[model samples]
Target: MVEVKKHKFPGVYVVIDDDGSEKIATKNLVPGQRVYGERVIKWEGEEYRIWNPHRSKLGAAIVNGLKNFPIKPGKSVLYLGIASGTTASHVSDIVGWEGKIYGIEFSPRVLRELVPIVEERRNIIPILGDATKPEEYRALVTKVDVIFEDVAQPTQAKILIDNAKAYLKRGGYGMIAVKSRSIDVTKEPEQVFKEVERELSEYFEVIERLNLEPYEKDHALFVVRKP
Candidate 1:
């Protein structure tokens, strides 16, 4: 049997197995529905999907002592590069029924896997578009409380700025996973993060930065707020 406990952050839980091993999870909003083949654990009358840090940058951030988790229950989010909905699925679970997740993916095939799951996870809306061009999907998405970006573009900071300008509410928050190699292989990860942080400060008040070391190398997660 597994025991479930709530984390400091709302909508997040820790599942402790009989062996005393623990894993962070969110209550499965869709019950038996699975996305990205994540492990499901049943405790009492509820189901929780263990968040895999290896597969999700957001998960890595949480495990790595991330502060200022803005994606809470009933908070709408814009997920840039939400390919196949691995992390987005957990985001959906956190947001539950009242909140929404507008997921933008570049390819139709990637959004294809996300479509089938949305039948049960109705809160997730898969949008086929480019993050670089936020206006292109303006008609479909509304102002959101938070923006979570995972795109691998070289100009990922710019993309976040554009999307925040277009979709994020004033004084809202933004979370991004910066892949240093994706931005610049020539520079060290810390140097790349510094540059990205500087760029992000132009459009936001940089809040928290966490290193995703063991789960994802050369990656840093930033949480910022719009001024």
Candidate 2:
């Protein structure tokens, strides 16, 4: 077993094996790194940064046990809420050069940091737009094999469904990173996950609802497949 870099914000910790010789933890996130442009990434060893487990529950989820996601090389993916292009860079690494990765982000501040990396043709396309609005860039995206949504909005399930119907290929898969505080801080995290699952079940098959804990406080992952 390996130790993870910890903090109040949600962070992702990955221990390669029981030996603990090799590992990667998503903590101490930088605004932008040279490795994959301006996004949160693992620093080699220059300096230890702040670890916020709450802010990036997606990274935390992956570190836990949500590795069944099918985002691989040569697969076309539409990434919603590409904040600072952190996770998008990781997704691009998984897709490799053969696949196309579309990152749709709403924040201009984050977009500004993302442009430098996207311009290098690192297999990530940054779209400065809102995740709630998909039709605006409908033409830009063709049929995609997967939908990776990181939008923190409450109606995230609806947005995913609409996006799948529009771009996700038949029988495709999707991974949605839902934030409990974003949806309803007043309600329990379990309730929010189930509610979102119920809504998504209408459009997609609920593969699993993994509760990301220890790593990500008050967060869950919704993995589904298109009908």
Candidate 3:
């Protein structure tokens, strides 16, 4: 069985399933109760939800089937475009209490919902600002173990690579949730992935490239490891 961790809070639960999968649930949480459907992915009575924009690159990737991210305790994470902290909660569970998740969100409304939800976990620190410009929020972030970027702007790959270079420690990994529509809705998904790959090759050692199938469409997930 996979080891599971619990959060010390009023209402949150996380469990590593018997299959070594992590399950989070905000069982009592209802829609419109908070942002990102906070009560989804219930585990050990805890609630987990990541408010993903169907239009956002990361949302598409998750829907395609992103699991076993390989993040653990004591590892710090830099989340680009944290949105409403749906996936952030799941990552929090993965890293446990000792780990910290530094989230950057440009939208105030999203942050408004994300901040309060994670206040109890104390593992999440949301910075209301631009994810593209990491320098502005660099102080709050130290060297991190992973950089998770969900931004879908045309220059999304550049944004993620730059932040990863500046903040992620050596041997760290950079995970980019790529949206073909954001890159080029007119082009084929394979074509878009190739384009992003060429751009990412300049900065990172491309490790694994996988598409989020079934869970999402026209979405790709690329994992880049820092040398």
Candidate 4:
């Protein structure tokens, strides 16, 4: 028998398996539905989907000790690069029915995979558009409490900035997963991170930066707030 424990971040949970394995999970937004073939735990009359850090930047950030988790209960989110909704699924669970996610995926092929999932989990609205061009989805997305950018673009920070200006509510939080290899394969990872930090600081107040090591190499997740 195992017990479910509350994580510091609301809507997130920690459960200890019989083998003494403690894992991070989210209460399933769509009970009895599986997302990405993730392992599900049914405990205390509720189902929880394991949030694998290796598969999600935000999950890795949390496992790596993220200080600022702005995507809590009832928070609307604009998700950039929500490919197949792997990470977005957990975000859906966190925000619940009261909150919603405008999921922007550039590739139509990839966006199709999300459609079946959203049929049951109605909180995420999958959009077919590019993150670099936030104006393309202006009509579909409203000002939101958070903007989560996971697009592996050369101008990752710029994408976040552009979307923040377009859909992020003032004082809302922004979370970005920066891939150093995409930015510049020639430079050091820390240097790439510093440049992104500076670029984001120009438009937002950098709240916390967590390096998602072990789970993801040369990847950093930054939490910022539009001031």
Candidate 5:
């Protein structure tokens, strides 16, 4: 039997396995529904949807011991490369009804799946656009408190920096899940992270960096904020 308990992170819970590995979960905002094949457990009077670290970098970051939880209730978040709303769905649960998420996805095919999810969520605004060109969606999105980016482009960090220039509020925080293999397969992961750090340093103050190992290979999560 899996043991369910509350986590230190707001709106998140821990599901302990028989082997002792913990799964991060969020309180199901929509009862009796599964967003993306995440296992749902009904404990007491509440339901929690499991967040898979294998599929979500933020989940991996939490597993890797992220000290700060920047996203909060009633805050606005701009999510870049929100592919199929896997992690974004859990994020929706964390931010609640009062919070808002502007989800930007490039692929129309993926957006087709994401649209239905956002429609039901209500708090999320699904936008079919390119993250590299934040100006295209400038009118749709305002300055947000947190920016979450998880794109596979080689210059992913630069793209997030550009978006921050347009939509991230001063002193707002940002989290980027960098896939080192995508940036440069030839270079070492640390080398790739250093390159990204140099690029982001111009605009953001680097706060924390955590390597997402076992859950995701050659991937890292960088937490930064506007100065």
Candidate 6:
């Protein structure tokens, strides 16, 4: 037997099995469909899909106590570095059909894989462009309520800031999944986070910072609100 309970976070739920094992899940937005090999569980007249933290930094951040969830239903999102549409699909689940996701990815190689996923989910628009140069894709994207970035560039924060300035609305929310090694492998992770935080503070009001441990090494999630 399994018990399902609503999570404090919107669009997420907890399932506790009879054996006391627990899993985090999302209410199936795309019913009878699977994205990226995620497991599907049917229970009590509803379907819930597994959300693996190990594969997704945003999942790990929420599991590790990320305070704010700005990506809600009916809100538009601008996603930078949407590689293969893994995490972006889950964000699509959260936003539902009423919301939209403008996905930007530089590599045509990866876009080839991502295009099919977005085609299935009509709300997402895939854009092939460089995140650092938002101007290149400015015509393709609209102002959004939230911006999520997971680029591995050395200047990841700057890329997010630039994209946010171009596409994020005032008082909107933003999240950057920071890979410490990408910024500076030689420095301590905390030091790298501080430096990145300082850089992000210039454009956004830093809200919450989290470490995605056990799932990812030397990785952090920075949540901010644009003023």
TM-score of 4: 0.98
Global local distance difference test of model 1: 0.91
RMSD for all candidates, in order, please.
Answer: 1.0, 6.5, 6.4, 0.8, 1.3, 1.3
Model 6, 137-164: lDDT tens digits are: 8788899999999998997988988888
Which candidate leads the pack in TM-score?
A: 4
Tens digit of per-residue lDDT, candidate 3, span 1-227: 63335434323344564567554332233322344444344434544553343533444444344453535556788988888777676566557777789999998987888877775767889899887788898778888999988886888988988897799898888888788899887988888899899999898888877787655677778888888
Which segments of model 4 are wrong by more than 4 Å? Answer: none
**Candidate 4 clashing pairs, residues 3+ apart or interchain:** none
Clashing pairs in 2: 9-52, 9-53, 9-54, 10-52, 10-53, 10-54, 11-53
User: Can you tell me which runs of candidate 3 are displaced by over 4 Å?
Assistant: 1-68
lDDT tens digits, residues 132-226, model 5? 88888988998999999999898798898999988889999999999999999999988988988888888889998888988888888999999
Per-residue lDDT for 102 in model 1? 94
Q: Rate the local accuracy (lDDT) of all candidates.
A: 0.91, 0.70, 0.70, 0.92, 0.88, 0.87
Write one digit per residue (lDDT tens) for candidate 2, span 141-201: 7889999898879888888998889889999999898888888879987788778888989
lDDT of candidate model 6 versus the reference: 0.87
Ranking by TM-score: 4, 1, 6, 5, 2, 3
Cα deviation at 32, candidate 2, in Å, is 14
Q: Candidate 2: where are CA atoms >4 Å away?
A: 1-22, 25-56
Model 1, span 1-227: residue lDDT tens = 67788898898887788788878899999898889889898887888999988898898888888889999999999999989999999989999899999999998998899999998889999999999998889899999999999987999999999999888899999999999999998998888899999999988999999989999888889999988
Please write out the lDDT profile of model 4 over residues 1-227, one tens digit for every residue. Answer: 67789999999998888888888999998999987999898887889999998888899899888999999989999999999999999999999999999999998999999999999899999999999888888899899999999997998888999888888899999999999999999999999999999999999999999999999999999999999
TM-scores, all candidates, are 0.97, 0.77, 0.75, 0.98, 0.95, 0.96
Query: CA lDDT of 87 in candidate 1?
Result: 91
TM-score of 5: 0.95
Worst 10 residues of 3 by lDDT: 24-33
